[PDB]
């Protein structure tokens, strides 16, 4: 009968749908590999999908996934066991080397452009018309670390023009230089900006940006990566 | 404690954004409205501009006509007495015509005629609004995803007060216009077909209704968790993968040994949700037309 | 067994218990102390259900079912064949659920990300504990809990519901349903929006978030924004489940009569309480 037909059709359909949805989700990261980075023997039931091509706007070129996967950077790690499945330890300074909770990806070294081809993120001083409309203004406040030590001062808010959102805080360090801090990794308080992920002596360690009026995708990744890893790696100095 | 990013710590404002132009006819956009600082704590603060245009106006008017038609009737019932109106607000109701009139427009006002008018207005309001979402996409050169997904929700709506009613032989089968009133119809519909829990599509529907709450809960939380690497910037993380997309993937890979990509999860998302009304539409369409008692059908399947 | 970009993330550390004893993977699965903890509770729990299966006389998923103690046993224990199994199994389930959450917390510390995920989950675990633990304990009997059976459990919903008439009148049930419906509307849109931008009309260039905001402004006049919609999604969901647990914790405890009756307070309000006409008098 109908209902009984309608229902089997559905199950058959739903299986192809899953199939499709599964392979679509294999455009990045595949094929799999062994810990040494050679192609892994078993790749699973689902095959790789055929390539698709994105037309990045603003003359930025194209992108085709799936495609050749490469870290395009060195990985300071060494095996801790003679078999698969175990942690790989940092052969140097995880923070400095960018491994583990402080990893970063080698993204394009350009900034993200908005709909019109303009830089998406700009320091507020260069953002005509932009101003703090609500909440406490961080510009001017001192910056404390997980060790309750002052490390610098906020001298500006870098903002997202199209989304109109505060994204980074520019912080001036002892040697008059600045660094960028993720808006998401800081606690703006009445008379101070508290940063838990890092101890005062780690701020100078934050990666720096070539130009002082823009951040490139690659730079944001190293900056955020570094700050996030402080959660695990700063821990010795972090108190309270 | 660490910051969570549910609400913003600082709001930053700039000149009102008029928005991309593409082929959009700028003549039909309105002026930018104010700025809610309230909304600003959660999401954007800018209001407007809104694009009106021909079809937009058709809908809006058509739509108020539906809402007004119903409300007039309610005032009938309320005896024009305001206090009554307010008191029995959840109780009033505009039921469709009686079984007698079947599929005819013959029935008098006070007997489904008025229901008929309202429905007609609502029918225009929706379909025009559907075309509007298709068109607004074309102007900006984007895919028609929103239009199709919306069709899914329309499918159920269509089956409920139009298709089934016809196939059954009367507008009598349709849903009345009332708060408590339409709840009953639902409870009743179930009882008369042998308790819907036995309807396989109803149960499938529910699987997706829950999965939507499951997946969006998962997805939202995921993104917020990796927003310290600027993950909410999904489109760019598609064209150029960053740690936000890698940690996000690895979290679930290590948790259920299975995972998705920054673009793929939205395919999961759009299908999970869309399947709720898709399956429900079928379930309801087969009730009273092909299957008369789901308990019985469940017994044989034939 | 490894994704092209995964090795750099598999560093030691982040575990909550037992140092690096269980700090390792099995294929793609992270383990840890809680990985083991859940395997245990689950393995054991499945066994108990299988056992409960022989006592019933069936090995059919469509019929197997583990019923709780009868209202006679109140809140005390019961014999295995008469509600005891369900009790032990429930502990194992709760045990598996807390472990999975806590295991995610570890996966979180290793990747240096937020704890939003395990936190949202804790909301589901709470809904479950409302039905099998808090509500029953407040009604003095494991017997009010639901049974672990595919259809037998749908029976429990149907009865429990109809015990108060059309459950549709539970006010918290209404709010709850609202959030659920909204959530799906929201998920539909969010998914369709990102896709229509990442996948524009043939040949055209990939749209941008600007186009996304533009689109909705044009359409409905407002745009929550890329970060907002994700805050919205998390919030709609968790809210939906919160109100679900609430509509149930109050049902059978502070209100045991017909839910439809509850609405009389509104209608009985003095001002209009006796006015003639309308649907009420
Ligand atoms: C919330 C109110 C009621 C309730 C009301 C309903 C109603 C009404 C319906 C269901 C339906 C289902 N319910 Mg229920 N259900 C409840 C509580 C539970 C609990 C629990 C641990 O408390 C569980 C595991 C389930 C599980 C299930 C599924 C078997 C089935 C839905 C598929 C789905 O998409 O789910 C959402 C989850 C996902 C999409 C993720 C994937 C999860 C999979 C499907 C889980 C399978 C579990 C398996 C059957 C049990 C395995 C145990 C073994 C020991 C491993 N329910 C409570 C008590 N449930 C539907 C059905 O078809 O029933 C016959 C249905 O119509
Ligand atoms: C006592 C009654 C029965 C019962 C009877 C029914 C009946 C009858 C139906 C459902 C349906 C559904 N039921 Mg049930 N159901 C029961 C118990 C349950 C339980 C439970 C835990 O006990 C659950 C989880 C569900 C779950 C569900 C959903 C999966 C499904 C509806 C999806 C939806 O999004 O619709 C909402 C979505 C729409 C209505 C889409 C259309 C919307 C249109 C396009 C928009 C109009 C907008 C308006 C004009 C606004 C203009 C704008 C202004 C600003 C306002 N039911 C009991 C046992 N259920 C429906 C279904 O699909 O079933 C197969 C259905 O018909
Ligand atoms: C799917 C199965 C049943 C069904 C079962 C149920 C059940 C069960 C419940 C509802 C509830 C609702 N249903 Mg219904 N409902 C059906 C079909 C419809 C049709 C149309 C089909 O085409 C519509 C528009 C509605 C609309 C509504 C809403 C009025 C209300 C849910 C809020 C929500 O989540 O909105 C999603 C939509 C938006 C967020 C946008 C639009 C805004 C809406 C229109 C606002 C309604 C406000 C309300 C009238 C105001 C109360 C405030 C007063 C101060 C007291 N139903 C079908 C036939 N419906 C709930 C309720 O509370 O009922 C009393 C409820 O528990
Ligand atoms: C005839 C019956 C009554 C009725 C009686 C009830 C009753 C009784 C209850 C509900 C509940 C609910 N009802 Mg009802 N309901 C009716 C009609 C409706 C209609 C409609 C359109 O008519 C709708 C939309 C709803 C909607 C809803 C939901 C809001 C809510 C269930 C979701 C929930 O709690 O999830 C919460 C999620 C969970 C409980 C799941 C927990 C999952 C756990 C943590 C993990 C499990 C993992 C699993 C074992 C793993 C498997 C692993 C394998 C590897 C796969 N009802 C009718 C009128 N409804 C329930 C509620 O509010 O519950 C609190 C409830 O008890
Ligand atoms: C997977 C299916 C899910 C889904 C999807 C979905 N809904 C959608 C879409 C999609 C993909 C849209 O694109 C469309 C949309 O536009 O979204 C923003 C929409 C939409 N889903 C809506 C509702 C809706 N969806 C629901 C459900 C669902 N939608 C499912 C969960 C429900 C439920 C649960 O019942 C409802 C009520 C609409 C809000 C919207 C389509 C709007 C529409 O058709 O409008 C016609 C216009 C009117 C009726 C205008 C008058 C309205 C009121 C009667 C009067 C008060 C308001 C008026 C604006 C006041 C004017 C005052 C004047 C002074 C100016
Ligand atoms: C609270 C908000 C929403 C939500 C969120 C949510 N769910 C989550 C998460 C989140 C954030 C996860 O991280 C976690 C996950 O990893 O998902 C992929 C999960 C998850 N949500 C799941 C299910 C689920 N979520 C549901 C709902 C929801 N989840 C809400 C809508 C439902 C419904 C609607 O019923 C179900 C079935 C799981 C698939 C998964 C968690 C997996 C887990 O904890 O695994 C380890 C445990 C086992 C293998 C346990 C077996 C334990 C017992 C000993 C045996 C069986 C006993 C049980 C009582 C039998 C029931 C039989 C039924 C027939 C009644
Ligand atoms: C930022 O973008 C995002 C991603 O990626 C960048 C993502 O991936 C995801 C999430 C990923 C998806 C792929 C979504 C897929 C769709 C769903 C509908 C998922 C939910 C449904 C399921 C059916 C999941 C299956 C559930 C489980 C638990 C499978 C695990 C299987 C087992 C047998 C359990 C393992 C058992 C144990 C005991 C673990 C420890 C093991 C030992 C041996 C010890 C999201 C939300 C996202 O937003
Ligand atoms: C202060 O008071 C004022 C004046 C402002 C107005 C007050 C109004 C009020 C208070 C209105 C309240 C209305 C409410 C609460 C309405 C609720 C409706 C609900 C809950 C559900 C609706 C279900 C309806 C669906 C299933 C309807 C589907 C209809 C169709 C698919 C179309 C039907 C099509 C027909 C009859 C054909 C038309 C004719 C042709 C030739 C195609
Ligand atoms: Fe998203």
Curated annotation (Swiss-Prot), chain A:
Topology within the bilayer: Single-pass membrane protein
The protein, known as: Reaction center protein H chain
Keyword Membrane annotated: yes
Record GO terms (molecular function): bacteriochlorophyll binding; electron transporter, transferring electrons within the cyclic electron transport pathway of photosynthesis activity
Cytoplasmic-facing ranges: 22-240
Compartments where located: Cellular chromatophore membrane
Protein source organism: Cereibacter sphaeroides
GO biological process, one term: photosynthesis, light reaction
UniProt KW keywords: Bacteriochlorophyll, Chlorophyll, Chromophore, Electron transport, Membrane, Photosynthesis, Reaction center, Transmembrane, Transmembrane helix, Transport
SUPFAM superfamilies attached to this UniProt entry: Photosystem II reaction centre subunit H, transmembrane region, PRC-barrel domain
TM annotation in the entry: 2-21
Main localization of the protein described in the UniProt heading: membrane
From Swiss-Prot, chain B:
Name of the protein described by the UniProt record: Reaction center protein M chain
GO cellular component entries: plasma membrane light-harvesting complex; plasma membrane-derived chromatophore membrane
Residues passing through the membrane, by range: 53-79, 110-139, 142-167, 197-225, 259-285
InterPro entries per the UniProt record, alphabetical: Photo_II_D1/D2_sf (IPR036854), Photo_RC_L/M (IPR000484), Photo_RC_L/M_CS (IPR055265), Photo_RC_M (IPR005781)
BP-aspect Gene Ontology terms: photosynthetic electron transport in photosystem II
Amino acids binding (7R,8Z)-bacteriochlorophyll b: 182, 202
Localisation: Cellular chromatophore membrane
A Pfam family annotated for this UniProt entry: Photo_RC
High-level lineage: Bacteria, Pseudomonadati, Pseudomonadota, Alphaproteobacteria, Rhodobacterales
Species, as recorded: Cereibacter sphaeroides (Rhodobacter sphaeroides)
Binding site for a ubiquinone: 252
Topology relative to the membrane: Multi-pass membrane protein
Keywords: Bacteriochlorophyll, Chlorophyll, Chromophore, Electron transport, Iron, Magnesium, Membrane, Metal-binding, Photosynthesis, Reaction center, Transmembrane, Transmembrane helix, Transport
Tree of life domain: Bacteria
Residues given in the record as Fe cation binding sites: 219, 234, 266
Gene Ontology molecular function terms on file: bacteriochlorophyll binding; electron transporter, transferring electrons within the cyclic electron transport pathway of photosynthesis activity; metal ion binding
UniProtKB/Swiss-Prot annotation, chain C:
Biological function: The reaction center is a membrane-bound complex that mediates the initial photochemical event in the electron transfer process of photosynthesis.
CDD domains in UniProt: Photo-RC_L
Assembly description: Reaction center is composed of four bacteriochlorophylls, two bacteriopheophytins, two ubiquinones, one iron, and three highly hydrophobic polypeptide chains (designated L, M, and H).
GO molecular function, one term: electron transporter, transferring electrons within the cyclic electron transport pathway of photosynthesis activity
Entry's localization field: Cellular chromatophore membrane
All ranges on the Periplasmic side of the membrane: 56-82, 139-170, 251-281
Protein name: Reaction center protein L chain
Positions bound to (7R,8Z)-bacteriochlorophyll b: 153, 173
Family according to the record: Belongs to the reaction center PufL/M/PsbA/D family.
Cytoplasmic side: 1-31, 112-115, 199-224
Keyword Electron transport among record annotations: yes
Membrane topology reported for the UniProt record: Multi-pass membrane protein
Residues holding Fe cation: 190, 230
Keywords, comma-separated and alphabetical: Bacteriochlorophyll, Chlorophyll, Chromophore, Electron transport, Iron, Magnesium, Membrane, Metal-binding, Photosynthesis, Reaction center, Transmembrane, Transmembrane helix, Transport
Annotated a ubiquinone binding sites: 216
GO cellular component labels: plasma membrane light-harvesting complex; plasma membrane-derived chromatophore membrane
NCBIfam families for this protein: pufL (TIGR01157)
Classification via Pfam families: Photo_RC
Any single biological process term in GO: photosynthetic electron transport in photosystem II
Residue ranges crossing the lipid bilayer per the database entry: 32-55, 83-111, 116-138, 171-198, 225-250
